[PDB]
From a paper:
Immunization with DNA plasmid coding for the salivary protein [name] (formerly known as LJM19) was shown to protect hamsters against the fatal outcome of visceral leishmaniasis and this protection was correlated with the induction of a Th1 cellular immune response. Recently, a combination vaccine comprised of recombinant salivary protein [name] and a genetically modified Leishmania donovani resulted in a strong protection against visceral leishmaniasis, further suggesting [name] as an important component for a visceral leishmaniasis vaccine. In this study we present the production and crystal structure of [name] genetically engineered in yeast as part of efforts to develop it as a recombinant vaccine for leishmaniasis. [name] is ~80% helical, has no appreciable structural similarities to any human protein, and has limited structural similarity in the C-terminus to members of insect odorant binding proteins.
Recombinant [name] was expressed as a soluble secreted protein using Pichia pastoris, rSALO(P), with yields of 1g/L and >99% purity as assessed by SEC-MALS and SDS-PAGE. The structure of rSALO(P) was solved by S-SAD at Cu-Kalpha to 1.94 Å and refined to Rfactor 17%. [name] has three predicted human CD4+ T cell epitopes on surface exposed helices. Unlike its native counterpart, rSALO(P) does not inhibit the classical pathway of complement; however, antibodies to rSALO(P) inhibit the anti-complement activity of sand fly salivary gland homogenate. Immunization with rSALO(P) produces a delayed type hypersensitivity response in C57BL/6 mice, suggesting rSALO(P) lacked anti-complement activity but retained its immunogenicity.
Numbering used by the authors: 1 to 95
The structure:
């Protein structure tokens, strides 16, 4: 699908964070929320439409809020929410 690149990138980040979290490099409780600046940076700054930003924005916040898991598996669970919500359909094919 058209979506594989976005998906792979989110997949990669999740996995990296997981590995780092395992390594005791990251703390899963800092991932309990997210700023508007981070959001812009992973939406518009990378090809999400201005018009669509809030729509992606909502999925990210819902997902983050929905994941009350606070171990290293949080990173992977959040990614699961993002795929479940089809977040990648809002991004361009190449990125």
């Amino acid at each position: 699908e058209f979506s594989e690149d976005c998906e792979n990138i989110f997949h990669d980040n999740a996995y990296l964070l997981k590995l780092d979290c395992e390594a005791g490099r990251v703390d899963p409780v800092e991932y309990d929320d997210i700023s508007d600046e981070e959001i812009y940076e992973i939406t518009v700054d990378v090809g999400v439409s201005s018009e669509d930003q809030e729509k992606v924005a909502k999925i990210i916040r819902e997902c983050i809020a929905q994941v009350s898991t606070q171990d290293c598996t949080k990173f992977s669970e959040i990614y699961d929410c993002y795929m479940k919500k089809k977040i990648c359909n809002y991004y361009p094919e190449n990125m």
